[PDB]
Amino acid sequence: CRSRPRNVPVITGSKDLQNVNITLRILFRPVASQLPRIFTSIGEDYDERVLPSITTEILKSVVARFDA
Amino acid sequence: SQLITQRAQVSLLIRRELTERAKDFSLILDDVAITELSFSREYTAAVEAKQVAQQEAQRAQFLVEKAKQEQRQKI
Numbered sequence: 001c002r003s004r005p006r007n008v009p010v011i012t013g014s015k016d017l018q019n020v021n022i023t024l025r026i027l028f029r030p031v032a033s034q035l036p037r038i039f040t041s042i043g044e045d046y047d048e049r050v051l052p053s054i055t056t057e058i059l060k061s062v063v064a065r066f067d068a
Numbered sequence: 069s070q071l072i073t074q075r076a077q078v079s080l081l082i083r084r085e086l087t088e089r090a091k092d093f094s095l096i097l098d099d100v101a102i103t104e105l106s107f108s109r110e111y112t113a114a115v116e117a118k119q120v121a122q123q124e125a126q127r128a129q130f131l132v133e134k135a136k137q138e139q140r141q142k143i
Contacts, residue, residue, distance in 0.1 A: 003093075003094060005093055027092055027093060
């Protein structure tokens with residue numbers, strides 16, 4: 001339940017449609033109380049199932065609206 | 069050019085900003101410096117070419133002095 005940083009690169013198309021490579025560091029950690037549920041659904045390895053999806057979809061959401 | 073000259077303050081500012089970025093990552097920064105700053109090919113080469121242009125104007129100035137001496141020599 002301590003903290004870990006995770007780097008997600010995104011080759012995002014900008015407004016002028018320039019393929020810009022942007023590496024985002026997300027520091028993160030789990031939640032103390034709901035670690036039971038976290039294992040019932042996901043397991044011990046909660047982190048890796050999540051960070052890439054949200055981070056890629058969202059850097060795309062952002063830099064899509066932004067230019068090179 | 070400022071990154072090269074004003075580089076001490078470049079170090080200071082980059083150090084403040086990375087200190088604030090890396091504090092969230094649970095590590096302690098004490099002493100850090102910016103050490104490599106190179107630019108591709110052309111600034112130094114063109115500066116030296118400008119120096120050579122000035123010194124070549126002077127070289128042609130003494131070509132002009134030998135033009136006086138050939139002036140009166142061939143008179």
